[PDB]
Design a protein around this ligand. Structure first.
Ligand code: COA
Ligand code: CL
Length: 256
């Protein structure tokens, strides 16, 4: 069912995965790629970006979350025009910056396992340069509710992508919109769905209650038996929540 497509953003080749036509645009997390969203792409539809430096996209120097938001926004415009933007962790930071720069292209926001500030444990971030296996194991212990096939696969991916993982996490570590939400300057005017796995230790419940408190039209969904990787660990529950929200916002199903 899925297709891989390619577009050009200012000379940078960007790959995306796409399912059935739907105005939904997914943005993956650090050290990951569009394949993070396969369970959503096949059931809900839409497009998932491979950010530059990830998946089948070109490599290019990226020094901020804002720069990734530029690639994401251009890619959204070229594929779906306007969309519900779904971001996980780093991708949720990218989604927030995308909304702030280009609110017109966001029909709604889905903030998954993310935060207004994404400081990274120094034992992970500094541990990746010296003993990456230990750092990866620590990060993943905080990201999965259970070991098993998804955990093992992600562990191997991270071991294969340590350099990009460290670059991505360094961008997270510098990402901070917290006070701008707190002091009321940053306003999210679109419908928002905030999703977190009950066991998530990388971006815990309080990060998601923070969004829910500061965003007027937000709904919070905590998914039991999942941690940070909720869209992979509990995909059926995740999809049901997302589909209910898409109905609410009017992003119709368009079968056949
Ligand atoms: C790395 C870490 C220990 C640094 O902690 P720190 O030096 O206290 O600095 P922070 O800026 O994160 O936190 C300071 C305060 O802001 C709050 N805060 C930070 N990020 C927040 C967010 N996204 N939402 C709401 N509150 C937040 C904290 O709760 C804390 O409040 P407190 O003083 O009342 O406890 C901490 O951020 C952490 O444990 N993070 C989770 C693990 C991780 O590595 N996540 C990866 C994210 S990509
Ligand atoms: Cl991340």
């Amino acid at each position: 069912m899925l297709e891989r497509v390619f577009i050009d953003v200012d000379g940078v080749k960007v790959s995306l995965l796409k399912g059935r036509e739907r105005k939904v645009f997914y943005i993956h997390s650090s050290g990951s790629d569009a394949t993070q969203w396969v369970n959503q792409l096949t059931a809900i539809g839409g497009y998932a970006i491979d950010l530059p430096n990830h998946g089948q996209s070109d490599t290019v120097e990226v020094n901020s979350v804002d720069e990734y938001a530029y690639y994401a926004s251009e890619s959204l415009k070229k594929t779906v025009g306007k969309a519900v933007v779904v971001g996980h962790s780093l991708g949720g930071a990218v989604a927030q910056k995308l909304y702030l720069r280009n609110p017109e292209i966001c029909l709604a926001l889905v903030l998954v396992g993310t935060g207004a500030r994404l400081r990274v444990l120094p034992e992970i971030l500094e541990g990746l340069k010296k003993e990456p296996e230990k750092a990866v194991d620590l990060m993943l212990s905080m990201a999965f509710a259970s070991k098993g096939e998804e955990y093992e696969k992600k562990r191997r991916e991270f071991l294969d992508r340590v350099d990009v993982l460290h670059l991505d996490l360094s961008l997270c570590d510098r990402f901070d919109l917290l006070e701008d939400y707190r002091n009321g300057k940053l306003k999210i005017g679109v419908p928002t769905l905030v999703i977190v796995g009950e066991e998530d230790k990388l971006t815990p419940l309080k990060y998601h209650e923070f969004f829910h408190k500061h965003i007027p039209n937000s709904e919070l969904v905590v998914i039991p038996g999942a941690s940070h990787m909720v869209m992979l660990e509990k995909h059926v529950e995740f999809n049901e929540a997302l589909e209910k929200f898409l109905k609410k916002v009017g992003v119709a199903e368009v079968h056949h």
